[PDB]
Design a protein around this nucleic acid. Sequence first.
RNA 1: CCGGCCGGGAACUCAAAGGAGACUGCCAGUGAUAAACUGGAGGAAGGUGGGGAUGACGUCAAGUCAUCAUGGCCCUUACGACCAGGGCUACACACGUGCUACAAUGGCGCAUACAAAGAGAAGCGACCUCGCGAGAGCAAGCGGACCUCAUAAAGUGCGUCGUAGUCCGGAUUGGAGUCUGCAACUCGACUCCAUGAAGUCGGAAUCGCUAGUAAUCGUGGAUCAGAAUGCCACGGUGAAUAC
RNA 2: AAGAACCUUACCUGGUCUUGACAUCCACGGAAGUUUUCAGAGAUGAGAAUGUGCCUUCGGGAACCGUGAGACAGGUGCUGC
Lengths: 127, 151, 114, 98, 101, 79, 206
Amino acid sequence: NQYYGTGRRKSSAARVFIKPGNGKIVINQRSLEQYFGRETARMVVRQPLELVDMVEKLDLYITVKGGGISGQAGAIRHGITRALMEYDESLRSELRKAGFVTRDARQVERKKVGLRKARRRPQFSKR
Amino acid sequence: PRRRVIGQRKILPDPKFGSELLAKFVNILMVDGKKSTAESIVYSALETLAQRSGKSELEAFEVALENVRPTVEVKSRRVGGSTYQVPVEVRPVRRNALAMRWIVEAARKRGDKSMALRLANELSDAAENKGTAVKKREDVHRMAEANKAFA
Amino acid sequence: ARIAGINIPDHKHAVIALTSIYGVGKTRSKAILAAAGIAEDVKISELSEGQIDTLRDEVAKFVVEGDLRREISMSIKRLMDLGCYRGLRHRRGLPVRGQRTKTNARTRKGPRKP
Amino acid sequence: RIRIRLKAFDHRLIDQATAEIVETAKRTGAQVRGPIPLPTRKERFTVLISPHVNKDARDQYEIRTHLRLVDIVEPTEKTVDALMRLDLAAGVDVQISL
Amino acid sequence: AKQSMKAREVKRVALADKYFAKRAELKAIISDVNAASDEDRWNAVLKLQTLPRDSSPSRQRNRCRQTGRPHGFLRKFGLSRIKVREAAMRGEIPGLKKASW
Amino acid sequence: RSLKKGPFIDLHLLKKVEKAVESGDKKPLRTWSRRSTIFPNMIGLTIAVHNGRQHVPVFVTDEMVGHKLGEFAPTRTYR
Amino acid sequence: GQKVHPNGIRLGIVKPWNSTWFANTKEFADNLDSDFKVRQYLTKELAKASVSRIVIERPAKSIRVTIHTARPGIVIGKKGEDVEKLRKVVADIAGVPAQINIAEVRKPELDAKLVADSITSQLERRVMFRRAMKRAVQNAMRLGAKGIKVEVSGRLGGAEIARTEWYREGRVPLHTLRADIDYNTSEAHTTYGVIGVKVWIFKGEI
RNA sequence: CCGGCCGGGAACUCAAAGGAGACUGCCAGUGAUAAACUGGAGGAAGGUGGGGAUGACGUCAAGUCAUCAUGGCCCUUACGACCAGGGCUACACACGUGCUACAAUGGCGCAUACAAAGAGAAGCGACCUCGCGAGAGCAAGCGGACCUCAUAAAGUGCGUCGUAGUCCGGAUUGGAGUCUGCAACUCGACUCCAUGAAGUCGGAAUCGCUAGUAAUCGUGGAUCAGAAUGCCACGGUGAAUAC
RNA sequence: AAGAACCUUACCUGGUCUUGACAUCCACGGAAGUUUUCAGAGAUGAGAAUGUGCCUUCGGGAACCGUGAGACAGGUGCUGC
């Protein structure tokens, strides 16, 4: 039966679907490789799939919008570990031990009045 | 800080091969938040290092790191009005993070063609310890061993 | 390799070579080679000597390198003879297009000497 | 057929402005979709605070304009006069499409 | 603020409604690309000076409706930056409260 | 560097230029329009343009045509 | 001056708005100036009628003024004629349909505008300021208030230098946001200058 | 016609409402059996979770009488009122706050991926056609989760540049223009063509920041006919270090 | 100053005006307004045209405009000690 886990990260929002089958990954009807897997941090989406067995065990249908390049990549990694609900008490002990289900909020701070961007005070001069 | 004794951040390891150590070496070399352009320096400086050494991937970088790695460093502890340089042993966390910084200072100077070629020549000149980054380390050890009378 | 009054670089691509001529930059030099028929990835020394004079009657279409200078010097000496606003700014060594003169305008004024 | 969209500055006053138009329409007539929440157009006004210098200190305000839909589907003749002269909940401006 | 300046503005409001938005088509119809670009168009830049120096909506300074403060204006309220603050704190503008997001 | 269609003049300058040509060049003109160009019929006239506290007389030459009247009157006196 | 206005911070939480109507951004300035004309006029005429707040709600291209006054026997007058004689001149400056609606307050020493006008009127006619200051404290504390702070500022006695003197009883917490504080401010144009009375009334906890 | 494009779907993202959640609550140790502290568990979140709003009595006879209101003084054929041109944009100079740089983790060219937040009716202005371009003509749609502004840029792929004041820099300037407006000379922004300045990391000194921060990258808004590198907001990438 | 080409604008030079650009009261005229000419840099100075209504005490209304008379308006003038 097809399972689901959402995941979101820093103004991005993934929705991870998952089926038992071959080890392919479809993201927004692109390949995992040609969407950003040819780019840096290609395997933060494969980080939960390294620690518990991926090899050719289950495929991953993904669509994701919002955020940026590394913003969507963190949204998938949080979406897979919530999609990993099949073996939850066999998975989410050591999967929690490596992190991976902490949503890790840390939004951008709003720009403050008087400040140049949210911390940067403009150039104090004594005299 | 004043009140805190707080810890440090769990950095993410290197993607291409497992190394949390040179995942820090990317971030030291990284300027202006461009990490992807900093990594393509780091990899292309390693295979040209692996070309002329033969040591495979990070065992070449490990030899060149321990020859710039310092043991004793000086910091000015003021005692009763006076102000003089006091040698102290570097903590083992700082010990190689200070070593990875001095390569990047030696590799941003000595401008030949490109940063991947620049940083590969400083890793090579540190392996047989004749470069700028080992010139930095010896002078730090020159600050100790003459001013080692204070401890 | 010696189209008009100067143009002598070497080991340099043909469009970047033509910028040496006073009166042609990057848009005109891409049109000098588009009308003559020279691909812009070749150098001057690789460019054949029978194709160089194809550039010479192509740079004959712009006002270049000797005529542009005394068409510019003619208009500046014209304005200084009308006694206009702009003519008085050229006569005093002050910015003309309407820039700040209180603090900046040190390109026009020269070195900050006193 | 009946597109009721209505907007106001207050969320707890636009709630029963929408709940009662459901109670008026769905009871004596039929077939209403429901309150569709339609994201708020927050409009911020950053103004200075002093009658002179101190650019730095400011007060930042906003108006929040909440929106709703109703979407009554069929032209029910018990409902076509349920909107006429039964338009309570002042402070709310309502717009209709036919 | 200088009761002349408050009455100098309400002249420019009414006298712009008198001439332009009816005789602002004297530039739109006639300073326009057609076959009448020589004789009629030169009569459009002729008669647009026959109108007074005012009535052009570029002379609206758009002042505060209570004090006539020319600066700090807000188009949403019609007030300066001070009288929008004193009225919002009193509860005069519906919906306008302090924002902290 | 402006104004695609219609070189600009004020009417009180234009309708006074037409009077100064056909009656003949007699005396300088008191004008307040610095915003007006110099139409080609103005060559030979002696118009005095109000710089702000004077009216400096400027005898129109043949090359002062594209420019404006106030272009030939320094408004700020300096050293 | 460093404190927030106590009403404006609480407009979403406990205190309501004085004006309640929706208007889009085309007419919102014109619909706000008309609100100001019906307010400075209606405070000028009802100066002796002890008005605390007026509520301007505007449904369906029509005005509905709501006058909260301590003495509504002046506002209705005989037969309700002064109700009508106000309603005529509101429709000149608001938009032609109109209603006014009196709403009495039966404890006039708990509205902050009425307590401020009680001190303002006495400072006009040369009463001693500390007597007027403290008599509005004592009359309000016995009548059921859980706190009152009053504060006068200005010349206050024909002094050369201006000084502020304030007197409080009870518990008046101003940083608590559920705290219902009645705050309003009047000024007293004496012949030595302007004296500014302002008065907080802590009415209840939530 | 693979465009959620359409039938249909209400699961999911989302959108606003209504609730749950975090309290040193559990556990361990130290502690005067107290307050609390250190460590762990569970948990999306751990001890005021992050950020903001919120500014005590008072200090400086701090700032503002040029937003407004105001005691006194003074003008009241004038210190008031109207108009056209001018000035606030002057420039031997000195300082502050900024943006752009001095390049190769870069410039240019071609191709290509991923945003959030705002605004719109004398307004925002698709498609089409013209112009190298700023723009124009035409004419739909939208007072809007739908229509427009609006292609995000850094990134990545590919090619070249070869460390030179250079294909760095984009100052100054000449010519030709566009748009707004009655009007663009004083004194607007922008586009095209040409020009090709100083600058090769900056003396004594000195400032900001401990996390989605610094840094860098672009986007939107207010004021506004036009006129920002300023201000105020938004998301992209993303550190180093605290003994 | 969340935005100086004109306006803004308070400043300067010159051209004009005095119960006044804005307010109230009184007495007289005139329905308000709409069409253009001429002179002037414009403000203004005359025109030539056109319109003449809603309520009847019918010596008048109200709205608006013009004029004269004085109360006075007006002041981004001064003092934030």
